[PDB]
Ligand binder design. Sequence first.
Ligand SMILES: CCCCCCCCCCCCCCCC(=O)O
Ligand SMILES: CCCCCCCCCCCCCCCC(=O)O
Ligand SMILES: [Fe+3]
Ligand SMILES: [Fe+3]
Ligand SMILES: [Mn+2]
Ligand SMILES: [Mn+2]
Ligand SMILES: [Mn+3]
Ligand SMILES: [Mn+3]
Lengths: 284, 272
Amino acid sequence: HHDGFQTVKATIDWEHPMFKLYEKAKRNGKWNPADIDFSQDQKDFASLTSEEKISALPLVAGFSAGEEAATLDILPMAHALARQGRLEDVLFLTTFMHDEAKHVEMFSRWQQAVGIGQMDLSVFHNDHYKRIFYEALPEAMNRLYADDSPEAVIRAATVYNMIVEGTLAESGYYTFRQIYKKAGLFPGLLQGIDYLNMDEGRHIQFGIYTIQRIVNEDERYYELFIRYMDELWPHVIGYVDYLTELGKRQQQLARTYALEIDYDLLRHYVIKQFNLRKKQISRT
Amino acid sequence: HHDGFQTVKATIDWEHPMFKLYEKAKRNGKWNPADIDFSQDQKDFASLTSEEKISALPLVAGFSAGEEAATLDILPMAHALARQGRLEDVLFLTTFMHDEAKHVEMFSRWQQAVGIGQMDLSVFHNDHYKRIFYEALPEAMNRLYADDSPEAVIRAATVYNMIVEGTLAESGYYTFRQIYKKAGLFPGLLQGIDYLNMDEGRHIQFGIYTIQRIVNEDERYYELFIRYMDELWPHVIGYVDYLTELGKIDYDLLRHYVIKQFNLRKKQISRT
Ligand SMILES: CCCCCCCCCCCCCCCC(=O)O
Ligand SMILES: CCCCCCCCCCCCCCCC(=O)O
Ligand SMILES: [Fe+3]
Ligand SMILES: [Fe+3]
Ligand SMILES: [Mn+2]
Ligand SMILES: [Mn+2]
Ligand SMILES: [Mn+3]
Ligand SMILES: [Mn+3]
């Protein structure tokens, strides 16, 4: 039952950080995947040999499942904060969920447009990927339906916002630009990636806000945050090494397009993101 | 756990009715309550007598709580359809939920602007209103966390989309126009109502789609729909009568609009 309603008894807290993030989301979130022109992407993909065609699909396979999981698995966080009466967080999360829906749509439209929608891309999810996206992420979020303790909320935001979004997604955006933007391939996908990257800035800020406000009540949760980050790192880098090894064994695209794909630079960027996400949470 | 992902094994079902409704929601759902100019509404409100001021508040109190319940209480429907693999339904429901968030925002901005944000409008929720919005609606939606049977889904969509939205919300939009537009009062609020009414057409279309697809599998669910509608009617009309009595423009015309909405929502679901 509802005991009452904040906007009947009072008003929205207009100065709440998540209300302000909600306002930015509305201003900055107007893009529509359906407006992206993928016609040149189709031409580029058809121009590639079978070998070069593969080069791109592991990254896309990882994003497409990632966005779909993101759309499904944010709902328990919205429920948990709703039940706690955090109306402004809920408002913001409506924009978060609608963002992820557009991300799912964007990658699916690209697969359809380039002619691979019929191809099962699950073959590029190795065991580490599945540990994060098929298992740990839904387990951490779904926990919130029966356990919305500070410990549970911190773990959910860590896995979702700090690891999946703040480490993997961010490193995937960078990787996409380092490879396909340099090669001049897939302009529509790159337009998508840039929209996604803009959206993701708000999603990571929500996670930072959430974790920090819990750490602010008891700095003992800071150690829990660090620990959960470190627990998932082996699967983060396990997946990144899988992708790297795939890239190193599929050299055709980089040769054709005169790219010196510095995979050691990519790996360094992932480590960099992981440690900088840790640093955006303060003990005090 | 996730067993797999539809957009990795295949793609979105581009022809799915809720994907089409999602596409329409993006194209038609751009409005922003922060852009509505409420400055004249403030002046209009200040120009009313004390008694006229209090005459406007019950309808607003009904809506502000209704939108807030709507925002919170659609989440279990999104979860249950997600768990069923109904990906295109979920995509659409992200636009549904963000719509209700903007509706909450719009009424609260109006209350702030005209100077009543500090006033507790719960005084204007009577027992019938509470039965629907404080109790039956959250009860029926939250049930979906543990029971997503066809019967539970039909009941949730009946209470939410056909009664709260399809009967009360639609009747409130009409009421605001019949009263305040003819009076030339609260133009910002009426711009908001127009945007809300446009959004609401999609929300009601989702409820129709959901209820009919369950009815299509077994015609005995049609009788459940009708029964759930009738069960809620006494509270619908008990709240409407309470509002009508406070006002004492043609209240009988308004009251008949509610009955008309109720019946036509019933008619939009087919036995066969
Ligand atoms: C070769 C370097 C590897 C870099 C790592 C690439 C990671 C690709 C996986 C993308 C999944 C991101 C899902 C985002 C979820 C969200 O949007 O909230
Ligand atoms: C004087 C005649 C009364 C007519 C009916 C007035 C009803 C007021 C509306 C309250 C509920 C609105 C909540 C709808 C939720 C949504 O937007 O989905
Ligand atoms: Fe995200
Ligand atoms: Fe609605
Ligand atoms: Mn391994
Ligand atoms: Mn009564
Ligand atoms: Mn995303
Ligand atoms: Mn509404």
